[PDB]
């Protein structure tokens, strides 16, 4: 019923399915070491992209800093340019009233 | 051929088992590498976020940058107009003697 | 024994059929995850370029803010040097107006 050569068959038959299932392992192992590798590199470059934008943002923070103070130096400026205006009109006005005389 | 038969058997056994071992090793590994992928989709996004208020600091920056400008020259005029007017007084006073 | 070997060759046909669905699934999974890597890929490289924008406008603004901290000194040399010439003209009108 069952004889040696019919099983040989299936053997045969088992063995040609194993090869073609190996090779698309094959196949696949040889993705997942190009993806790893990619993953990796892409890895490596955003922690780069990080620290060069943390180096931005921090230059960022500064000009932040600055940008108050030198607004707080302008406002001080004004106010001593309005100072001696006060000052000149002093003047201004008292030597209009010695020159009439 | 009773033992060629049980030796083939014996080796596709062997090899089968082997397949099956591996292929959980891939699925662990491809599983491994959809989380790290996740991983850097989140990071990525998060560094988009990040830059972009920075880049909206900046043009917070530039609008700054225009208005003080603007009130540098402006004082600047100011400090110019005076000194025209001190310098007549200046001359006023060294003519009234 | 020929039913045992088959029952062997039915158990290995189980685990084939196993392996095929997995390498299946494995498959169709692969294809996404390199269209995922390839898009971050491309959003990496994109958010690179913007950063790299921003940073040349950050340099602009840091040599901005040294040319107006360099004019607001300049202004406020001059508006010493005017209180200066403002207090002598003072002075002597108040020197004129004694006595
Ligand atoms: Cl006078």
Redesign the interface.
């Given at each position: 019923?069952?004889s040696?050569l019919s099983?040989?068959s299936?053997?045969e038959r088992?063995?040609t399915?194993?090869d073609g299932?190996?090779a698309?392992?094959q196949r696949?192992?040889e993705?997942?070491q190009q993806?790893?590798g990619?993953?990796s590199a892409?890895?490596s470059?955003?922690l780069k992209?990080?620290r060069?934008?943390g180096a931005?943002?921090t230059?960022?923070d500064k000009?932040?800093q600055?940008?108050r103070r030198?607004?707080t130096?302008?406002k001080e400026?004004?106010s001593?340019?309005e100072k001696?205006?006060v000052?000149?009109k002093?003047?201004?006005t008292?030597?209009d009233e010695?020159?009439t005389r």
């Open positions: 019923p069952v040696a099983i040989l299936l053997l088992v063995s399915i194993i299932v190996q698309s392992q696949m192992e993705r997942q993806l790893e990619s993953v892409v890895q470059e955003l992209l990080a060069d934008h931005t943002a230059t960022v000009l932040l600055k940008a030198v607004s130096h302008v400026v004004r001593r340019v001696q205006n000052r000149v002093k003047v201004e008292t030597q010695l020159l």
